[PDB]
Amino acid sequence: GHMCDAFVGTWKLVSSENFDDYMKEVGVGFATRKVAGMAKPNMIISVNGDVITIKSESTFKNTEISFILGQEFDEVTADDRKVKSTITLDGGVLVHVQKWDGKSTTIKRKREDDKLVVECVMKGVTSTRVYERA
Ligand SMILES: O=C(O)C(F)(F)C(F)(F)C(F)(F)C(F)(F)C(F)(F)C(F)(F)C(F)(F)C(F)(F)C(F)(F)F
């Protein structure tokens, strides 16, 4: 249960690039996009045996996903998509693919320097969000 040791802890947002464009490509509505952009999320990543939990906390929406690496699971995203999600550990990076409605998006959670970087890709649009330890 050590696969994820470099990710565990609490994290807070430093910077965001192209996040609104990413949500646009995903199909998120205007009001939800504006709420999401205003959020200052606190992210908690924790491990309990084989089960990893990623929690995002913000004033107006929390999400929590718990999963086993490599095991597909049902996720209801913050924008209310019902997706089939699989997260694997590849080259020290958590690679999260969401599949729904004939579409897919990939969320990579990686370490760079002392930061946790979240890279989200939808049809060639990439958002990069940088977190520092809380
Ligand atoms: O900052 C992070 O923790 C993050 F980068 F990991 C993340 F949270 F942004 C994400 F990757 F999970 C995400 F982009 F997919 C997302 F969950 F936010 C979303 F953009 F897909 C979303 F649309 F669901 C929304 F922004 F939360 C919504 F618009 F619904 F509020």
Swiss-Prot record:
InterPro entries: Calycin, Fatty_acid-bd, ILBP, Lipocln_cytosolic_FA-bd_dom. Pfam families: Lipocalin (PF00061). The keyword Zinc-finger does not apply. Keywords: Acetylation, Cytoplasm, Lipid-binding, Nucleus, Phosphoprotein, Transport. The modification N-acetylcysteine is found at residue 4. A fatty acid binds at residues 129-131. This is Fatty acid-binding protein, adipocyte. SUPFAM superfamilies: Lipocalins. Forms a beta-barrel structure that accommodates hydrophobic ligands in its interior. A motif (Nuclear localization signal) lies at residues 24-34. The lineage of its organism: Eukaryota, Metazoa, Chordata, Craniata, Vertebrata. The modification Phosphotyrosine is found at residue 22. Belongs to the calycin superfamily. Fatty-acid binding protein (FABP) family. CDD domains: FABP4. One of its GO terms (biological process) is brown fat cell differentiation. Gene3D superfamilies: 2.40.128.20. PROSITE patterns: FABP. It is found in: Cytoplasm; Nucleus. The modification Phosphoserine is found at residue 15.
